[PDB]
RNA sequence: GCAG
């Protein structure tokens, strides 16, 4: 369901800003997770361009200049 | 009539004759507080009951005691207006006379060694003003009545909403007034459990074993026995035949004869009657009839002493054999027949692990105080402190009444603590409800909900403060200083006063009063609230408590309620609703004796109302009392049905009995949908008072009541003649009938001029009477805010046309003419108070001064030499009102600023401009300045000027009251002196002060002269001691807050005129925002040239079905059509015969109205005065649900020579050609609501930023910044607006280095951002790293 | 330490000095008030204002009316920039003083700096992405934002006290996103279904419905017209009614298979009003699109047809022209609601007396025990529901064709020109379900627990509800209002869960 | 307490 799928993202920042912050943050902490900031909530939280729309070109440039 | 009601008589269209006039609308507040503070020798109410509830206070050892003899309220230090000015509570000191009795050391009684009796001050209790308000910290607050669940026992269920089997599970709940809740409930296995304070549940027989009942006594209480007695052989069984109702016997029944029912055949009531006709008392059943039967006694051996079977032990044939061997020919056994007598108690006697009372007390201890080892002496004290000590459990008088009423006892009074009997009876009634012979209580029934009001909540808080002080005085009385201390040395007034202080100031129910108009006040006082302390929460309050119940009829308004998250929780009391002495709402009905409706009213509560059958108010009846019909619509059980005319028991007392006071003012309420009626009722209370109050052309008849029963007006206390009248006072010369002996006989009414309401409107009283005019007891002498000649008037009578006009009244907009602005119709005065506080800072004190740095002498032109603005100054936004400078240090100029000041030499100033300025956009007149100086700070020239003006005014007011009163005394002395020994040629020349001592022939008249001279001497003694009190209250220094040196409050008066954006409305829920202020010549106009004042949208009527607003238009055109007829007759100057004839034809119109205005009894002066007051439209009265029919509206339309369809043809004002269809034109009553666009418009480019996270601050008071919430961020993510979003996050809001770069980039003309990280993300990272979690940013 | 990190998780919360629990480190970052939701996912924003919205129907689709007093403050750095750039101020402090004094040149500078600079208008709740839209500002004198009418349906805005928040796109990228992604002339279709969301409503659709109807013997009937211009000349001269059925020569263009427009010309049988309305129809559209009585659905389909055939740019001009002509001809009609417009059928009292006879028969049959209270109640409900539908049919049949007028002497019935019926039938406001309660009976009500009361409200709002029927009415009205109040929090939480899963 |  949409709640258990929102909290089972690969991003602890999305899932931690949705709800149940304590569970998401403790699980991510003991697992030592790494949030690669791929969605839109992680890029709104850190004040970056969202990877969708007019900020899609910039993120593609970012993933063509750092993977190579 | 009156003399104030035949000035302008409202034409009443109501037809039902009224038998009960509307009561005092503020009886709830005034009666509650009067119960609280009045002396009560019986000791049941208020402070006396609260004192007897705590006192006497024995010591721990009983050697001494503190008893209470009496209390007494002091006089208030400041009157109400001084309390509103100085910002202090209006309260009275509670001085209580206590007595410390010291007994002796060795005495058979503890005889009195000493008594020390003295009067100790404990606290100040706030005082209800004479309008039902409290002035608490200078603001007027209303303590709202609460609607809470009555104490008592409440049986309820959950209707199969557990365990998916659809099994209804019952639960009783004992709720006390104070103390621990006690619930009993059933589980899905039919086992009775118990909870105490909603913590985990125990088997219910544990609370039965904590009371000293054994298992045998428990089985005795909850059951009856089928006695098996062993006669000669074959297990004879005693038979009570009704125990055999409705079963299938496993065996045929043979008693001395006939076989009644064979094996496996079902038993019906014929078989029971047959067995009792045979008088069967004995059976011999198969032996396996005892396979499953539970013994009901403790059956032990006499031979071997072995306990064969104790109680609650299921029997078997082997047990039967070993039990019969001991000479036990008597076997008592439980009778549990399925579906009518369950095993629930005998089933729970197996689920509880407890065997004895001490183990049960231990188990209750373990549930209550877990983890702590239970000892006997504490487990058996916890239980008798739970429900059985008056110190900790009070079921109260309402609790005991509802308790015994629920258990069908005949005594309504008793002890406030529980008993064995009460708990056992509650369990019995719960078991009865399980066995289908009971019914659960409806928890939203208004017999189960109770009005707890101001004088009861205030007493509860006072008694909490009293127990706080009495624990300390018990702690102090058991010390050994006991001989030399007085009772006021052990009483601390600060806990007691702090309890009532936090109640009156900080409770949820102690609310800032609505003071828009009189309706807002008088409906804030009649307000019921489910919320509050001890009530619901608006989030957790369900759907069912928010609904209108059938017992709300006549007790609580169905329509006047809020519309947002607390709907159905804030209620309004209906017009006639009272409260019981217990607090349950009750409403009056007329008794129907034999089919004749008596005029004897009975106040029925919600439970009594459901027994009788009760006619409607619309039920017709002839003048004999009899119902002219024979099948009457009535309500009998909350169900509504038709009944005969001889089943009818009561009748509703009025047609407006069902609605509140605010909904009683909507004409044609019966035509509005209930949603639009709710909105109209709620938007009548937001209507601001305009410059000139305008009566409603179409009222309902409650306008006089609302205007008088709210204290906004000045009503004559005794009748008389207006001796003097003036814009600020009215001096009434009382009739000789109504004045007391030895009295001046003069009433002074000091009107209130241009004061601030809580909503910053102005509350200003204008004298309604003119000079030399006779007034009576009860007439309105002064129109307050929003009243016109004693009638509540909240808006103006605008001429509306219903037509779509060129897009300008699209979607609830309103197109206003310009003549509504020229004529200052909706122009309202708003008064703001602005305070400039000169404080003491650590770098020196702030000073109020006119030598302000960096400000030219053009801005300081309105300030006087004290630095304060001049009274009467027309200021605008940005003007300095109170010049104040702050000392500052830490200057630290930049290198460039250092060079700039070494070039020009203009040095920096050591003070910083901290002035008070008019807020932006505000433009008004300073009308008042008040200066408060801390004692010890020297007053400037202006504070001394203001003090000298106040002393001049105090002396002038008190000398003028003495002049008026002494002139009245001398007129009364002159009247008495000429009643015998006439001096009419002598009296007017002798010096008047010798009339005080002129000895006349004493028949009895010299006694009256003695009393009149005593009156004059007392007035001369009293004026001086009032003036000296006023001088010492004026010149005394102020108790300011700590740190502040002085406070300058400046009062601006802003006339706000109507303008596009201002939200207007009507009485029918037809709100709307003004879209355009249209020229006069653009408005649509009729054939006579009269343009329309307001063009409304007709599409707003049919979907939201408030049809009433159309009828009020059609009637409002009829009424004006009468007015502009009378107006014509006053310009041609017709004789008063023609005017009298036409006005009589207008007041006699209507089909069987209740009023008769026969103005042949009117003089010609009275007819011309009435015809002058009716020349602006004749006011109509359309009582709610009884109003003017459509045919009466058409008949009055025909009398004014208007078209009976209500629709005239209009021409376009712009093109001069006719609109192709007739247009509804009439006069609606438009209200200007307090949502003015001047107060809503806000804008901010840059401003002040929040402290922890660096985002903009919140509201337009702090220069705001709008919240770009989560949903708007989604809306920008849904477009691809990544850059707009990234600037909403970084540089508009949080980026501290990016916001200033963006500012200087915009100023440079370079619209480019350099976004960083939001500061709040850094705050978050630091707040997660402080949790011991290393959150990082991977480069 | 456990109370510092997460207060109240183990056992009892620590309350300090208020008997109100202490806000721990975990409560700073968690919940509806934590950093994540209060401060990171949405925040307070500079260059933003707020005011009451009001109509302004003169506007074009892409512009709002922004008060000068709000625009002077939201655009303050822009004005300081242009004030120094144009040499009117020597220093940004001099410019600050100039805009504080509101000198007459800062109003010309302000007209310069808002010129092609869009603003975002936002109404909360921003339920869907058309809750924020960019408009070009037009400086007005009031204090209320003037919102073009066609966009209101997208914002869910009525002018009964609604307020909207203004935001300023600062950079060039944000200005071009407001121009290119969010401008209201780009959002004419709904992102949910494809249907037009910038669509005419209550006043416009009533004006266009009244214009495109036909009366039987209307003034100037049957004449032959050279074109739509002659129809407009006749109607403005008063020589032909707006509903006169006439014969007009209409030239219309079809899109050829290649993409170009080809003309055709034919005498159509129209009315004068459909001819007048043809003058605003863009070219590539058939004449059959206006040659009918245009309700709400016909106008929404007309706009959709223009969008699919001709594209966005002619549709925007078309929609504004529709709004102006609908507002104008709604004003010309004077379509007003009077109390005689709610015509109650005269067979209502007879229908209700027959239904009362039937229920009394069922009651005295229940006294005869042949029916249980259950089927007695069920049959009484069904023989009141049949009465309610008979009343509603009699009302609507009496209402919808009550115009019986003459052609060459002989009477003939037509669709009604009743105002209530024109409003219900246009789709402007209301439905037959509300005309039912105005003029029929308002029917059976339900108790608060859902079980419907066995005797209906036999009265309607043109007559009075008596006090008991009104009480019964409030039973369900407060249930609907409380449902509305407590289901917005139930829907907003679903929306939040869906946005966070997707 | 209220506004939409
Ligand atoms: C005298 C009067 C009627 C007899 C009885 C019946 C109901 C009783 C009140 C209620 O119990 C509520 C409340 C309980 C507090 O404990 C004490 C105050 C209150 C107001 C009581 C006062 C008094 O006792 C009342 C009015
Ligand atoms: C007509 C009436 C009775 C004769 C006389 C007796 C007392 C007189 C008032 C007092 O003097 C106080 C005051 C003085 C001001 O100067 C003018 C107003 C006041 C109210 C006077 C009005 C008037 O003159 C009064 C009422
Ligand atoms: C705490 C407890 C209950 C609710 Sb709610 C509610 C919400 C907004 C306005 C009024 C009420 C509620 C609970 C019980 C009965 C009735 C209402 C609520 C719960 C789930 C989804 C949406 C709202 C919210 C917070
Ligand atoms: Mg709205
Ligand atoms: Mg609140």
Author numbering:
A (entry chain D): 1308 to 1375
B (entry chain C): 3 to 1341
C (entry chain D): 303 to 804
Any passages from the paper?
Bacterial RNA polymerase (RNAP) holoenzyme initiates transcription by recognizing the conserved –35 and –10 promoter elements that are optimally separated by a 17-bp spacer. The MerR family of transcriptional regulators activate suboptimal 19–20 bp spacer promoters in response to myriad cellular signals, ranging from heavy metals to drug-like compounds. Here we report one crystal structure of a multidrug-sensing MerR family regulator EcmrR and nine cryo-electron microscopy structures that capture the EcmrR-dependent transcription process from promoter opening to initial transcription to RNA elongation. These structures reveal that EcmrR is a dual ligand-binding factor that reshapes the suboptimal 19-bp spacer DNA to enable optimal promoter recognition, sustains promoter remodeling to stabilize initial transcribing complexes, and finally dissociates from the promoter to reverse DNA remodeling and facilitate the transition to elongation.
When including ribonucleoside triphosphates (rNTPs) in the complexes (see METHOD DETAILS), we obtained two structures of the RNAP-promoter initial transcribing complexes (RPitc) containing either a 3-nt de novo synthesized RNA transcript on the heteroduplex DNA scaffold (hereinafter designated EcmrR-RPitc-3nt) or a 4-nt RNA transcript on a fully complementary DNA scaffold (hereinafter designated EcmrR-RPitc-4nt). The RNA transcripts lie at the post-translocation position in both structures and RNA synthesis starts at position –1 and –2 in EcmrR-RPitc-3nt and EcmrR-RPitc-4nt, respectively. Compared with EcmrR-RPo, both EcmrR-RPitc-3nt and EcmrR-RPitc-4nt unwind the T:A base pair at position +3 and pull it into the polymerase through DNA scrunching, leading to a 1-nt transcription bubble expansion. Despite the same 14-nt transcription bubble size in both EcmrR-RPitc structures, only the longer RNA transcript in EcmrR-RPitc-4nt reaches and slightly lifts up the σ3.2 loop, indicating accumulation of significant stress on σ as the RNA transcript extends beyond this length. Other than the differences in transcription bubble size and σ3.2 loop conformation, the overall structures of EcmrR-RPo and EcmrR-RPitc-4nt are almost identical. The kinked spacer DNA conformation and all of the essential interactions between EcmrR, spacer DNA and σ70 NCR are maintained, suggesting that EcmrR-induced promoter remodeling is required not only for open complex formation, but also for initial transcription. Intriguingly, we observed strong extra density in another hydrophobic pocket (hereinafter designated site II) in the cryo-EM maps of EcmrR-RPo and EcmrR-RPitc-4nt. The density likely corresponds to the tetracyclic sterol head of CHAPSO, which is routinely used in cryo-EM sample preparation of bacterial RNAP complexes to alleviate preferred orientation problems.
